[PDB]
Design an enzyme around this catalytic site. Structure first.
Site, PDB file in Angstrom:
ATOM      1  N   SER A 196     113.929  49.328  74.027  1.00 11.70           N
ATOM      2  CA  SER A 196     114.218  48.796  72.691  1.00 11.70           C
ATOM      3  C   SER A 196     115.726  48.639  72.541  1.00 11.70           C
ATOM      4  O   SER A 196     116.330  47.948  73.380  1.00 11.70           O
ATOM      5  CB  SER A 196     113.545  49.681  71.657  1.00 11.70           C
ATOM      6  OG  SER A 196     113.453  48.977  70.432  1.00 11.70           O
ATOM      7  N   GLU A 323     103.826  44.816  70.702  1.00 17.52           N
ATOM      8  CA  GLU A 323     105.163  45.164  70.221  1.00 17.52           C
ATOM      9  C   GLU A 323     105.246  45.165  68.695  1.00 17.52           C
ATOM     10  O   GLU A 323     105.860  46.057  68.090  1.00 17.52           O
ATOM     11  CB  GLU A 323     106.176  44.169  70.794  1.00 17.52           C
ATOM     12  CG  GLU A 323     106.372  44.196  72.292  1.00 17.52           C
ATOM     13  CD  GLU A 323     107.060  45.458  72.796  1.00 17.52           C
ATOM     14  OE1 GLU A 323     107.430  46.317  71.973  1.00 17.52           O
ATOM     15  OE2 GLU A 323     107.306  45.551  74.026  1.00 17.52           O
ATOM     16  N   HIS A 436     104.860  49.330  70.442  1.00 16.63           N
ATOM     17  CA  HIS A 436     106.257  49.528  70.784  1.00 16.63           C
ATOM     18  C   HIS A 436     106.531  51.004  71.021  1.00 16.63           C
ATOM     19  O   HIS A 436     106.164  51.849  70.207  1.00 16.63           O
ATOM     20  CB  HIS A 436     107.105  48.990  69.625  1.00 16.63           C
ATOM     21  CG  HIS A 436     108.577  48.938  69.892  1.00 16.63           C
ATOM     22  ND1 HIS A 436     109.160  47.957  70.669  1.00 16.63           N
ATOM     23  CD2 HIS A 436     109.594  49.697  69.422  1.00 16.63           C
ATOM     24  CE1 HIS A 436     110.470  48.136  70.695  1.00 16.63           C
ATOM     25  NE2 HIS A 436     110.760  49.179  69.938  1.00 16.63           N
TER      26      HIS A 436
END
Ligand SMILES: *[C@@H]1O[C@H](CO[C@@H]2O[C@@H](C)[C@@H](O)[C@@H](O)[C@@H]2O)[C@@H](O[C@@H]2O[C@H](CO)[C@@H](O)[C@H](O)[C@H]2NC(C)=O)[C@H](O)[C@H]1NC(C)=O
Ligand SMILES: *[C@@H]1O[C@H](CO[C@@H]2O[C@@H](C)[C@@H](O)[C@@H](O)[C@@H]2O)[C@@H](O[C@@H]2O[C@H](CO)[C@@H](O)[C@H](O)[C@H]2NC(C)=O)[C@H](O)[C@H]1NC(C)=O
Ligand SMILES: O=C(CC(c1ccccc1)c1ccccc1)NC[C@H](O)CNCC1CCCCC1
Ligand SMILES: *[C@@H]1O[C@H](CO[C@@H]2O[C@@H](C)[C@@H](O)[C@@H](O)[C@@H]2O)[C@@H](O)[C@H](O)[C@H]1NC(C)=O
Ligand SMILES: *[C@@H]1O[C@H](CO)[C@@H](O)[C@H](O)[C@H]1NC(C)=O
Ligand SMILES: *[C@@H]1O[C@H](CO)[C@@H](O)[C@H](O)[C@H]1NC(C)=O
Ligand SMILES: *[C@@H]1O[C@H](CO)[C@@H](O)[C@H](O)[C@H]1NC(C)=O
Ligand SMILES: [Cl-]
Ligand SMILES: [Cl-]
Ligand SMILES: [Cl-]
Ligand SMILES: [Cl-]
Ligand SMILES: [Cl-]
Ligand SMILES: [Cl-]
Ligand SMILES: [Cl-]
Ligand SMILES: [Cl-]
Ligand code: NA
Length: 527
Positions: A196, A323, A436
């Site tokens: 990320s 995600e 995510h």
């Protein structure tokens, strides 16, 4: 008793029993002067020598940061919150080394994510001892400053030049170069990996000339700098700095005097005001992030990427199947972690306004039109799933694919993965899918611990991913050569092959999200 002479003084580690073997852990080694007082908002300073023994036997403070309380008591969110004291005195790193001490081990350096506003290296899902134990690599992770304290930019003003957290990361890389050999590590075989905002940091180190010589190869999990949240323009960076100054009563006509005023504010006064420096936000708001500073970043990074101005080496890049969904429960109407979040067409349209607040009505109609070509138009999860894919494709998947295409156009091997296994232990509900952040535990090898109640298939998958990542770091090629695995082919701009990762059947596919990413990368910028 294992004690290592570094270039700044002796450090003492601790022995850890992992899988019937031993790993030596050095938690909390300092790598910079604490950025306190006059050093707040400055680039990190070199560490003054010490003559005693530093006891690197517990994780150090995490950097100041807001802790969201959206789901109090819920492990799904609290597993991400810092697990050491918040302090400005947080510039520490950690080292896991196999036992016995390796001769010339490849080094993996973790850079955590957290939207550049949160994060700490002491999270349980970042525990590097499994990798050290199982692949005999050395794992390093550092704490770096986040939020305003790490990224406030009065650009050109060295009192607040921007990118301080990125320079923290870089100073830690420099520490590995100077010291890792004393731990049995190979400074010439260093692979950065992050997820990320950490993945976006990794991609910025590929662009930064100061970082060129501090690592060998790079792994980017669910992030890259060309993602829309990852770089703040100089215009916004100055508006946000002056807004923070107004909120703290630190408006001064001399720009250098603002920073003096902000340097006398408590960390909490700064933190509680970070949220309101933008008039409108989204769940993916990054109020204080990387800027083009003329130092870490010499030019707008899309230009550096497009014209091949980056470290030439191999990369490993990938994304998770879902995600987007984590962001939907932090603000989209009709979404909940406690029900199945079936939303109507009208709720989908309000969802778009949340995630695209300053986009024209025609722009939002184009998104709706692209994402509502139902396979089954009787399906009631249709809008819930489309909003997730809108947020995931736009914010992570399509930017990562574009980064990998542009990077490989300059002749380097790139490898792209699509992670689609939903952790059996995942505390979030099933409609949120492969979220995510939830490949990290597989990369770090947590399912290798049979006590933890992951499934057998999950142990296999983690074992395979750990070997692929280690083979990438060691040899620049993420194969699992022994267990008749699917061979992972290089991502080339023309065919664009990628590997899916999952328990049932790891397979090769082409042109991930081809039609979605044409819309986001080519059409959507024009609206
Ligand atoms: C640049 O900042 C100004 C000022 O932001 C306001 O003041 C800050 C201290 C903080 O409290 C913010 O939340 C405020 O929004 C922005 O100007 C504001 O814009 C909004 C929406 O356009 C408007 O309703 C306010 O009245 C404006 N306030 C003032 C004082 O002008 C401006 O939009 C920012 N520029 C951007 C975001 O590009
Ligand atoms: C799913 O839940 C959301 C959130 O509602 C909260 O959580 C639920 C589990 C339940 O305990 C509610 O009573 C809670 O308030 C629902 O959206 C809310 O709906 C109410 C009803 O008018 C509204 O006042 C709130 O503003 C809504 N909040 C949000 C964030 O949308 C939603 O309707 C539920 N969906 C389904 C399919 O059951
Ligand atoms: O973690 C962040 C970062 C932020 C972000 C912003 C832009 C790009 C990437 C990340 C984010 C992430 C996920 C949801 C909302 C915001 N911020 C603190 C908030 O507590 C979010 N909790 C962290 C976890 C929630 C559940 C699963 C994901 C992680
Ligand atoms: C340790 O190994 C060094 C060579 O490292 C290898 O070559 C570089 C270019 C990278 O590609 C890396 O992945 C490789 O592992 C030697 O030069 C050095 O002398 C060795 N030192 C010791 C003490 O063994
Ligand atoms: C470090 O740990 C050792 C053993 O636990 C202890 O004897 C020593 O006094 C410690 N040093 C400091 C400075 O606390
Ligand atoms: C602003 O402050 C700096 C720091 O002391 C000083 O050098 C400068 O002369 C001041 N005035 C202006 C107009 O910049
Ligand atoms: C390959 O298979 C054996 C068992 O057949 C297993 O013990 C080993 O860990 C596997 N290795 C990888 C890298 O998956
Ligand atoms: Cl700019
Ligand atoms: Cl899919
Ligand atoms: Cl379309
Ligand atoms: Cl419909
Ligand atoms: Cl469920
Ligand atoms: Cl469902
Ligand atoms: Cl396979
Ligand atoms: Cl697809
Ligand atoms: Na697909």
């Amino acid at each position: 008793d294992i004690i290592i002479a570094t270039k700044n003084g002796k450090v003492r580690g601790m022995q850890l029993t992992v899988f019937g073997g031993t790993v030596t852990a050095f938690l909390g080694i300092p790598y910079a002067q604490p950025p306190l007082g006059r050093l707040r908002f400055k680039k990190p300073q070199s560490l003054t020598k010490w003559s005693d023994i530093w006891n690197a036997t517990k994780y150090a403070n995490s950097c100041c940061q807001n802790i969201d309380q959206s789901f109090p008591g819920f492990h799904g969110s609290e597993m991400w919150n810092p697990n050491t004291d918040l302090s400005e005195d947080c510039l520490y790193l950690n080292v896991w080394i196999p036992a016995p001490k390796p001769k010339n081990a490849t080094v993996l350096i973790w850079i955590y994510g957290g939207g550049f506003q949160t994060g700490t290296s002491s999270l349980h899902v970042y525990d590097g001892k499994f990798l050290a134990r199982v692949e005999r690599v050395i794992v390093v992770s550092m704490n770096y400053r986040v939020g305003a304290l790490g990224f406030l930019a009065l650009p050109g003003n060295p009192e607040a030049p921007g990118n301080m957290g990125l320079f923290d990361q870089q100073l830690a890389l420099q520490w590995v170069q100077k010291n890792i050999a004393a731990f049995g590590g190979n400074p010439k075989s260093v692979t950065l990996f992050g997820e990320s905002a950490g993945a976006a940091s990794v991609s910025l180190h590929l662009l930064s000339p100061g970082s060129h010589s501090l690592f060998t190869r790079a792994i980017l999990q669910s992030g890259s700098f060309n993602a829309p949240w990852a770089v703040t323009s100089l215009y916004e960076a100055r508006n946000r700095t002056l807004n923070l100054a107004k909120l703290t009563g630190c408006s001064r006509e001399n720009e250098t005097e603002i920073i003096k005023c902000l340097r006398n504010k408590d960390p909490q006064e700064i933190l509680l005001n970070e949220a309101f420096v933008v008039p409108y936000g989204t769940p993916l708001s990054v109020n204080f992030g990387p800027t083009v500073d003329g130092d870490f970043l010499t030019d707008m990074p899309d230009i550096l990427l497009e014209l091949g101005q980056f470290k030439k080496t191999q990369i490993l890049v990938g994304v998770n199947k879902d995600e987007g969904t984590a962001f939907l429960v932090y603000g989209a109407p009709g979404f909940s972690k406690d029900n199945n979040s079936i939303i109507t067409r009208k709720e989908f349209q309000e969802g778009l306004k949340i995630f695209f607040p300053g986009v024209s009505e025609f722009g939002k109609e184009s998104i709706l039109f692209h994402y509502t070509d139902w396979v089954d138009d009787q399906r009631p999860e249709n809008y819930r799933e489309a909003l997730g894919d809108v947020v995931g494709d736009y914010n992570f998947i399509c930017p990562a694919l574009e980064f990998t295409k542009k990077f490989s156009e300059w002749g380097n091997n790139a490898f792209f993965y699509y992670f689609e296994h939903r952790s059996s232990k995942l505390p979030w509900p099933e409609w949120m899918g492969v979220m995510h952040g939830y490949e990290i535990e597989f990369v770090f090898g947590l399912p290798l611990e049979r006590r933890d109640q992951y499934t057998k298939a999950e142990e296999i998958l983690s074992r395979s991913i750990v070997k692929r990542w280690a083979n990438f770091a060691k040899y620049g090629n993420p194969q699992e050569t022994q267990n008749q695995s699917t061979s992972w082919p290089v991502f080339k701009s023309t065919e664009q092959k990628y590997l899916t990762l999952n328990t049932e059947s790891t397979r090769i596919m082409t042109k991930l999200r081809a039609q979605q990413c044409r819309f986001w990368t080519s059409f959507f910028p024009k609206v």
